[PDB]
Amino acid sequence: AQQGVFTLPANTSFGVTAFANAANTQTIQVLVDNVVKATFTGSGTSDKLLGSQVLNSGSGAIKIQVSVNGKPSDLVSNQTILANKLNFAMVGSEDGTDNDYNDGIAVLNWPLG
Amino acid sequence: AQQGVFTLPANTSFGVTAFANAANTQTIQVLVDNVVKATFTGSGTSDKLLGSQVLNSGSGAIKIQVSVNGKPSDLVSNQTILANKLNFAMVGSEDGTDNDYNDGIAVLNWPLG
Amino acid sequence: AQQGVFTLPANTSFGVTAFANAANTQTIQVLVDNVVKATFTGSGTSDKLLGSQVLNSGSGAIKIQVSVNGKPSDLVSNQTILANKLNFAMVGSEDGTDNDYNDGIAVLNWPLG
Amino acid sequence: AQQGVFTLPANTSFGVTAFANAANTQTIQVLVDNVVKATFTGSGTSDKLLGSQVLNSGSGAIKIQVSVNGKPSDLVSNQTILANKLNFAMVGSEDGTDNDYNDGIAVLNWPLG
Ligand SMILES: OC[C@H]1O[C@H](O)[C@@H](O)[C@@H](O)[C@@H]1O
Ligand SMILES: OC[C@H]1O[C@H](O)[C@@H](O)[C@@H](O)[C@@H]1O
Ligand SMILES: OC[C@H]1O[C@H](O)[C@@H](O)[C@@H](O)[C@@H]1O
Ligand SMILES: OC[C@H]1O[C@H](O)[C@@H](O)[C@@H](O)[C@@H]1O
Ligand SMILES: [Ca+2]
Ligand SMILES: [Ca+2]
Ligand SMILES: [Ca+2]
Ligand SMILES: [Ca+2]
Ligand SMILES: [Ca+2]
Ligand SMILES: [Ca+2]
Ligand SMILES: [Ca+2]
Ligand SMILES: [Ca+2]
């Protein structure tokens, strides 16, 4: 199945935070309506914080991409809702062979405020 | 039910990242074996990043506390596992009456490496 | 936080399946727009299947109640979305003191078809 | 990523319940330590309940397979833990082109009792 694709409410601010757990440099892109709106880049094996940003969801069509020097990683994802209100969308990825799926991570959360 | 309590594998590094979406100052504490090992503090209504740290899980007994000037918030939490390997533990909290449950957030992830 | 409350898409069929893991008789009610539309009753400690039904979501306001002889149980719940399409809403409950939270369970899933 | 693979605690009873939302006949197999221990078969587009069984987890290595007349479906899965105690493992699958991922579903839950 496609992974890293999420439908958010339209015209809503969301946070996105990215991490590396990898020797290779991760490129984590956040697409809103098929257009890259944020890019996080880096490496490190101890949950390196690559950045955190707030974006508008546009029509609601979000897609997360993870790659290493142009090669797409294998993604895994899901979305969880707590208290019928607090949403998280998580993405892990695997750039290699050890299948730890932590190499490049994105965590989205909404609503804000 | 108790919320914000998680059993991790013992002696394992994990990341914890904290956010505010609140006018009031949040105090988010990460306890390992009943001892506070990290504290994140701040306010802001746009997914303010309060910090991110890597901790050892000790025996595995983690507890997240959220309070505002000493008053415990109402917590909500769960844990998700992706690809049978990548773990997230999420905590939201409500400090007031609007029930957005985003006031003080913690996201834990493991394994690292 | 309130638990067992879920917002579904309006006018959508969903499945709901109920289980017991309890010595006491569980009463598991599925409310749509504040009106009970299904009730599952029984006991048994080996994941007793109490029933499975398909309901219309009405406006989308679903609430699950669990009680034992009129006494409300303590609920825990969340919602997960897989492949940006397949939804599950889960409810556990505790009727006693052992905090296994499995006494009366409901699992909702949608969309059907 | 591989999907439908879960690590359970060893020597633990778990419930597994299977559904169809499909015109084609689904074959849903539950493997414990690489050996099929339950098989659910059927079709129907309204959350047809194919069965529910309790199994021992063996070493803990569970795998869910879904196929239609021998052809493996595309699986999606995850695991959620509520109240640090109640576990669900969910599997959806797609046998065709509409990407509803509901064609053959398995829901696992533990602990029982
Ligand atoms: O980035 C390449 C490689 O780096 C490290 O060895 C580990 O983090 C691996 O999981 C990762 O796949
Ligand atoms: O922190 C107090 C209060 O601040 C803001 O008004 C909002 O973020 C509320 O959700 C929060 O409860
Ligand atoms: O139903 C009462 C009681 O019955 C059994 O002892 C167990 O299933 C308990 O978890 C439950 O709380
Ligand atoms: O089973 C084949 C096909 O049957 C129906 O048309 C729908 O349930 C589809 O989602 C499914 O893929
Ligand atoms: Ca890796
Ligand atoms: Ca890694
Ligand atoms: Ca609030
Ligand atoms: Ca808030
Ligand atoms: Ca109980
Ligand atoms: Ca029980
Ligand atoms: Ca299908
Ligand atoms: Ca279908």
From TrEMBL, chains A, B, C, D:
Binding of Ca(2+) 1, residues: N21, D100, N102, D103, G113
Source organism: Ralstonia nicotianae (strain ATCC BAA-1114 / GMI1000) (Ralstonia solanacearum)
Pfam families assigned to the protein according to its UniProt record, in alphabetical order: PA-IIL (PF07472)
GO-annotated molecular function: metal ion binding
Lineage: Bacteria, Pseudomonadati, Pseudomonadota, Betaproteobacteria, Burkholderiales
Protein name: Probable sugar-binding lectin protein
Residues bound to Ca(2+) 2: E94, D98, D100, D103
Keywords: Calcium, Metal-binding
Record domain Calcium-mediated lectin: where: 6-112
Domain of life: Bacteria
